[PDB]
Amino acid sequence: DMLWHKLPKSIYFRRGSLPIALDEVITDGHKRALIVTDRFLFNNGYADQITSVLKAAGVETEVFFEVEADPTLSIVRKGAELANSFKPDVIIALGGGSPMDAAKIMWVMYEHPETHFEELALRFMDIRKRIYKFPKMGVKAKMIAVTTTSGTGSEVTPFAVVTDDATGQKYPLADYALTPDMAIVDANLVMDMPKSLCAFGGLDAVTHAMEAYVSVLASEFSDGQALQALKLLKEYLPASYHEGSKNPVARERVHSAATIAGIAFANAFLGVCHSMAHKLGSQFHIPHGLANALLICNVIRYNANPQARRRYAEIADHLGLSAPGDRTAAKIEKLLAWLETLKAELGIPKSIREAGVQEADFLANVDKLSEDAFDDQCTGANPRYPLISELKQILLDTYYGRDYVE
Amino acid sequence: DMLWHKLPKSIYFRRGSLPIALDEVITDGHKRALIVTDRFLFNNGYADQITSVLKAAGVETEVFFEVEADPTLSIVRKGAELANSFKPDVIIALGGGSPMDAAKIMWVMYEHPETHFEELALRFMDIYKFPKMGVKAKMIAVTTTSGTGSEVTPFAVVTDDATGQKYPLADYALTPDMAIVDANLVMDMPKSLCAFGGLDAVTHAMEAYVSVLASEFSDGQALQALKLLKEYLPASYHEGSKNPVARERVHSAATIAGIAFANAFLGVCHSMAHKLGSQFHIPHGLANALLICNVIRYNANDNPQARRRYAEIADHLGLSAPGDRTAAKIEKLLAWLETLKAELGIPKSIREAGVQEADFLANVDKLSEDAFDDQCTGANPRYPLISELKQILLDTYYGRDYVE
Numbered sequence: 108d109m110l111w112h113k114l115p116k117s118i119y120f121r122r123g124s125l126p127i128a129l130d131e132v133i134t135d136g137h138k139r140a141l142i143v144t145d146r147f148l149f150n151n152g153y154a155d156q157i158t159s160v161l162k163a164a165g166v167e168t169e170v171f172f173e174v175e176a177d178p179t180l181s182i183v184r185k186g187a188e189l190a191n192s193f194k195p196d197v198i199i200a201l202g203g204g205s206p207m208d209a210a211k212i213m214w215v216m217y218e219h220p221e222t223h224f225e226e227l228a229l230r231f232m233d234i235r236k237r238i239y240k241f242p243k244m245g246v247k248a249k250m251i252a253v254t255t256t257s258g259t260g261s262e263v264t265p266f267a268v269v270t271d272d273a274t275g276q277k278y279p280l281a282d283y284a285l286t287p288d289m290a291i292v293d294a295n296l297v298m299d300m301p302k303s304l305c306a307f308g309g310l311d312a313v314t315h316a317m318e319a320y321v322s323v324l325a326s327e328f329s330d331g332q333a334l335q336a337l338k339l340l341k342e343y344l345p346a347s348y349h350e351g352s353k354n355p356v357a358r359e360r361v362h363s364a365a366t367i368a369g370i371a372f373a374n375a376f377l378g379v380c381h382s383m384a385h386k387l388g389s390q391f392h393i394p395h396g397l398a399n400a401l402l403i404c405n406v407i408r409y410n411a412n413p414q415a416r417r418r419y420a421e422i423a424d425h426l427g428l429s430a431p432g433d434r435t436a437a438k439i440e441k442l443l444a445w446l447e448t449l450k451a452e453l454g455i456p457k458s459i460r461e462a463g464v465q466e467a468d469f470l471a472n473v474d475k476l477s478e479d480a481f482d483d484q485c486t487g488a489n490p491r492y493p494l495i496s497e498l499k500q501i502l503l504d505t506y507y508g509r510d511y512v513e
Numbered sequence: 514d515m516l517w518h519k520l521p522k523s524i525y526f527r528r529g530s531l532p533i534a535l536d537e538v539i540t541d542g543h544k545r546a547l548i549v550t551d552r553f554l555f556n557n558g559y560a561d562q563i564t565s566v567l568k569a570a571g572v573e574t575e576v577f578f579e580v581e582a583d584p585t586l587s588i589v590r591k592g593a594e595l596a597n598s599f600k601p602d603v604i605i606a607l608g609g610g611s612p613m614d615a616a617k618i619m620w621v622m623y624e625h626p627e628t629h630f631e632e633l634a635l636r637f638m639d640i641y642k643f644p645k646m647g648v649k650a651k652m653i654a655v656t657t658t659s660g661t662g663s664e665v666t667p668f669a670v671v672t673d674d675a676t677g678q679k680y681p682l683a684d685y686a687l688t689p690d691m692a693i694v695d696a697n698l699v700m701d702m703p704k705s706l707c708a709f710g711g712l713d714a715v716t717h718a719m720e721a722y723v724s725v726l727a728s729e730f731s732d733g734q735a736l737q738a739l740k741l742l743k744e745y746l747p748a749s750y751h752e753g754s755k756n757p758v759a760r761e762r763v764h765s766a767a768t769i770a771g772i773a774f775a776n777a778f779l780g781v782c783h784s785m786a787h788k789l790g791s792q793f794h795i796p797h798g799l800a801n802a803l804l805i806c807n808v809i810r811y812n813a814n815d816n817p818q819a820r821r822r823y824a825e826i827a828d829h830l831g832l833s834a835p836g837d838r839t840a841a842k843i844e845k846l847l848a849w850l851e852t853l854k855a856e857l858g859i860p861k862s863i864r865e866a867g868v869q870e871a872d873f874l875a876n877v878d879k880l881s882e883d884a885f886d887d888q889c890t891g892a893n894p895r896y897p898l899i900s901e902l903k904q905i906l907l908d909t910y911y912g913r914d915y916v917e
């Protein structure tokens with residue numbers, strides 16, 4: 108029953124931290140850097156912010172900018188083959204969850220060209236006690252994650268997910284050997300995020316912290332960070348959304364908050380909100396953060412039925428939502444009211460139906476969604492052990508915009 | 514103005530985590546382990562808890578158990594020479610701040626026998642590139658007090674025997690590769706060690722929260738350490754091993770305070786405590802306990818503001834009442850600390866800690882000057898004058914509250 112707190116060697120942050128952190132990459136003696144990113148970030152000059160600094164110091168650079176919305180095995184393999192040819196001694200992921208997750212798997216494949224993806228996907232889908240260990244990492248290259256959304260927190264986590272394009276099946280990988288060697292959290296890179304990305308990333312971060320706090324693997328080492336992320340998000344996410352680049356402090360606070368939520372869930376994991384959000388995302392092509400935003404309130408209601416209900420009340424107290432003499436039930440209602448108001452000002456629809464999913468389509472798939480969500484690796488940390496029938500009820504309630512009632 | 518959050522690769526915790534973490538040391542392929550500890554911990558079988566597990570797996574072991582309070586250059590050099598002869602691939606510090614700090618410097622000397630101590634002391638006193646670490650050996654810190662948090666920090670201090678001068682080293686290459694926080698190792702701590710370590714931890718978290726280098730990445734951890742300490746230190750001191758939950762919570766709290774100050778640093782409480790400790794041989798945690806309330810009063814002087822931050826701590830700890838103004842929140846924070854100190858048997862003044870008046874008066878100017886110069890001073894939210902530090906020291910000597 109040993110627990111842990113496992114983070115990157117260095118997390119660097121503050122506006123302008125990117126070039127300063129890169130100077131350490133240089134002085135560490137790195138000579139060949141592969142940047143892994145997407146087309147938007149390349150076309151908008153974000154990768155140049157990395158390569159210009161490295162080139163000035165005589166570091167050879169290559170940029171792979173072909174990561175798309177969800178990392179696919181074909182793209183990961185292509186990136187790995189570029190690594191095989193270019194031979195980087197540092198891989199630098201630049202972007203949101205998609206480039207960061209893709210880069211982690213490219214890194215494994217580069218370190219171990221003998222290893223088939225099937226071996227990785229079937230053996231290392233979760234964190235658990237094992238006899239056979241993850242293949243040794245960081246021999247050919249170190250991994251740096253530069254996050255440009257606020258955010259997935261992938262820059263500090265042992266997690267990656269890749270879609271097998273041949274079948275559409277998503278494969279989660281998890282091992283602390285995939286935790287980046289360095290995370291760079293520079294809010295200059297998120298000043299121009301559109302409103303939808305700001306909202307979805309921010310509510311993803313809220314969900315990460317919320318699930319990490321009530322997880323059966325929560326501890327005194329993660330609780331403070333989960334609560335801090337929630338406080339920062341409560342205090343700055345509205346302004347970040349409304350004002351964007353006009354309020355750089357709010358953008359910076361939220362960028363930090365998403366990483367801090369990462370610190371918590373990297374160690375405490377998540378719950379059934381993520382389980383269900385994964386399946387909604389895959390089935391209906393709803394962005395991850397939106398899917399979480401749609402489900403989180405009903406998951407709280409469900410989990411609140413070391414009771415989770417006491418923990419939710421602790422969050423209410425931390426966020427200043429409760430009044431003296433409030434009972435647990437009332438504190439939870441106040442937590443829910445806060446979340447509902449936050450969702451409203453961030454333009455989140457009130458139901459999956461209002462997010463554009465047709466009723467017949469939903470009903471035809473809801474049983475499969477419920478079964479798959481039960482089976483999801485995220486379910487194991489949820490404080491309430493679910494039945495498939497209960498997850499179905501949550502999904503239906505969320506589709507029709509009803510509050511879950513036990 | 515880049516900031517950072519830098520911790521050991523792994524922090525492992527919970528009662529019984531030591532043997533479980535050691536199994537990972539074994540499976541990582543370590544073959545030769547040097548344990549660095551003190552005589553008390555060796556004689557009470559604490560080192561055997563490590564060596565028995567490693568030996569059973571065919572790992573060669575050696576123990577250096579000669580670390581004393583205030584590690585000296587002679588002792589560090591002797592430990593380094595043992596490392597040079599034994600050739601460990603892992604160094605495992607076992608103990609409080611003295612073995613942990615000593616082990617960090619032994620590690621550097623073993624990794625770099627070519628390097629003169631003067632080079633290290635004069636170049637790396639304050640957060641050159643540090644000479645590459647972790648080539649010959651990884652560093653594991655196993656803390657047995659609650660505590661210094663040294664198991665997660667980039668700090669070590671050694672005394673030059675020849676002169677009595679203390680040399681702080683600070684670099685993230687000294688951060689352990691692994692910290693092990695196993696409260697089974699602290700169940701039998703005596704009351705004074707419990708008190709002094711606990712109040713050291715309170716001070717670490719308090720100074721890290723109001724430090725000019727505080728950030729959103731450390732603040733939550735500083736507040737968590739303070740909440741854990743408020744909630745469990747009274748029971749830990751009173752009940753000891755009869756309340757293992759409290760002992761466990763406080764052991765975690767000391768490390769969590771470490772997480773905060775490893776990154777946000779400290780302030781003038783530590784600056785003054787270092788000098789009181791060196792001059793009068795007052796234990797570090799006792800020295801901090803004697804000074805912390807007056808440092809709060811000093812730092813809280815009205816013209817973010819430290820005073821707002823202290824009020825935030827009061828709110829976090831549930832010490833404030835609705836409608837309380839900042840001043841009243843701070844008075845409630847101070848009252849909490851005073852009551853905690855009372856339970857823990859902390860003297861009400863430096864005089865009552867056994868320091869003779871003539872001795873104190875003869876040294877107070879030097880204490881004030883040295884405290885100003887201490888590396889810890891730079892992070893303090895109030896930029897001090899030597900005259901003000903002198904006043905704090907005198908007030909604390911005579912048991913008076915500092916008044917602006």
Ligand SMILES: NC(=O)c1ccc[n+]([C@@H]2O[C@H](COP(=O)([O-])OP(=O)(O)OC[C@H]3O[C@@H](n4cnc5c(N)ncnc54)[C@H](O)[C@@H]3O)[C@@H](O)[C@H]2O)c1
Pocket residue numbers: 145146147148175176177178202203204205206208255256257258259261266267268279296297298299300301304308385395396
């Ligand atoms: N299933 C899981 O466990 C899990 C968890 C996290 C991540 N993921 C995956 O990662 C992705 C989520 O990452 P994300 O939400 O951060 O976004 P993303 O990486 O999918 O990026 C989404 C879009 O935003 C753009 N973008 C990125 N940074 C920007 C910026 N600063 N300004 C403007 N546009 C920017 C990207 O170029 C892209 O077009 C999804 O594909 C999701 O499936 C999955």
Ligand SMILES: NC(=O)c1ccc[n+]([C@@H]2O[C@H](COP(=O)([O-])OP(=O)(O)OC[C@H]3O[C@@H](n4cnc5c(N)ncnc54)[C@H](O)[C@@H]3O)[C@@H](O)[C@H]2O)c1
Pocket residue numbers: 551552553554581582583608609610611612614657658660661663668669670681698699700701702703706710796797798
């Ligand atoms: N800034 C820095 O670099 C830094 C960091 C840490 C500590 N330090 C210094 O090191 C010291 C910190 O020491 P500490 O408080 O951990 O104590 P310590 O290591 O000096 O040990 C104090 C005594 O407690 C005993 N002891 C330790 N663990 C015990 C246990 N579980 N049960 C019973 N007895 C036990 C030891 O054997 C010793 O006799 C201070 O002097 C401090 O200034 C400096």
Ligand SMILES: [Fe+3]
Pocket residue numbers: 259311315381395399
């Ligand atoms: Fe998520």
Ligand SMILES: [Fe+3]
Pocket residue numbers: 661713717783797801
């Ligand atoms: Fe201290």
